[model samples]
Target: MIPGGLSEAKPATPEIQEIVDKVKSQLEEKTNETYGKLEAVQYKTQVVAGTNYYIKVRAGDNKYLHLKVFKSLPGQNEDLVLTGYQVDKNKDDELTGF
Candidate 1:
């Protein structure tokens, strides 16, 4: 198995939704475009000093975005952080760590 590597992409869960919601504002800030609805459809995760979540979110008709979110270790008390993202993605796009 690949240690410290990302897990295979999986369907988004309630927790994933929560994570997306928590960082939605940050993403909006980064892009300066507010989505009427932003929903995570799939995701992959990498375990590091904390964890990295690669998420594919549907923003509009046939449009998606890839988001890289970082969550600090529980003891650190740091909030979920939106570190990187890719725009103009689509449904079939593979969610990667980049």
Candidate 2:
């Protein structure tokens, strides 16, 4: 369940911005190289009021990536959740599942 309270927008750290920018650039480049050109690329970020934040990217043809960031224990770096996806060649072109 989503935690209570409205979500806030936190200024992403320089490091996090760098990572997001790199991923977006790479995805766009790769998509263009593979598909000639894409109609559009999109990204979103959501920072929960007092919880975690997430980033999402939509490249092309059902391809995408999702990232989640959260604080970690003291002495440890921030936690990251990353996942990638591509069109399913099989299963009638539906998204693949584990």
Candidate 3:
């Protein structure tokens, strides 16, 4: 769960904002090059251990990328941040897992 709390107006902290920026940049690279232009862009986040991840989804299809950030931290680095290729969710989850 989100610490402090969550709201429609809630903004990510500087750290998390930096993380989100990387997520977006990574999403762009992966989409245009490997995954093609995605029809939808979705994400799921979890605070596993201390690091937070934005599991980038290649929407309108069954594939999702749950990567390890490739040791890339939150900063000006624009390298590909995804590596591990997680299998697609159960078809049921594909529809409802958002």
Candidate 4:
């Protein structure tokens, strides 16, 4: 499989966007600040855990919210959520619950 965007495994692309919306709706305008306009996303599937979507979100403020979007195993938690977030202004994977 490609170490990148959507592929043969289901819920690849649009599902990820839905995740973005869910995250944005959680807060106020912060939905923009905390989350953001998704700039780019890459994907990879593990032998387990379905697939993990890595995304770069750019806020209108030009700030970025880098997160690991977890698309859990099949028929599992279909709702994609943040499994990591930014810390100390760094763009790195910090796998903490949302």
Candidate 1 lDDT by residue in tens digits, 1-98: 33446676788766777777766678778787553267777888777758778877777778787777778877467556767677666644456733
**Candidate 1, lDDT over the whole model:** 0.70
Candidates in order, TM-scores: namely 0.73, 0.30, 0.30, 0.44
Better-scoring candidate (TM-score), 3 or 4 = 4
How does residue 46 of candidate 2 score in lDDT? Answer: 38
Q: Write the per-residue lDDT of candidate 4 for residues 1-98, one digit (tens) a residue.
A: 33434322232354555555565554324333445345424322232365544444444444445445555656565545445445223344312221
Going through the candidates in order, what is the number of backbone clashes in each? 0, 0, 0, 1
How does candidate 3 score on lDDT?
Answer: 0.37
Residue pairs with backbone overlap in model 2: none
In angstroms, how far off is 67's CA in candidate 1?
A: 0.8
Q: Best candidate, TM-score-wise?
A: 1
Candidate 1 vs candidate 2: the TM-score winner is 1
Which regions in candidate 1 have their CA more than 4 angstroms from the true location? 1-4, 33-36, 74-77, 91-93
Pick the winner on lDDT between candidates 1 and 3. Answer: 1
Please give, for residues 10-75, the per-residue lDDT of candidate 3 as tens digits: 222344334444454554465443333332244334332333344344434665433233333454
Per-residue lDDT over 1-98 for candidate 2, one digit per residue giving the tens place of the 0 to 100 score = 34423244333344444445434344335443222122223223433322333433233666543333333344244333222323223332221121
Over all chains combined, what TM-score does candidate 4 have?
0.44
What TM-score does candidate 2 reach? 0.30
Cα RMSD for candidates in order: 3.5, 8.9, 8.3, 7.4
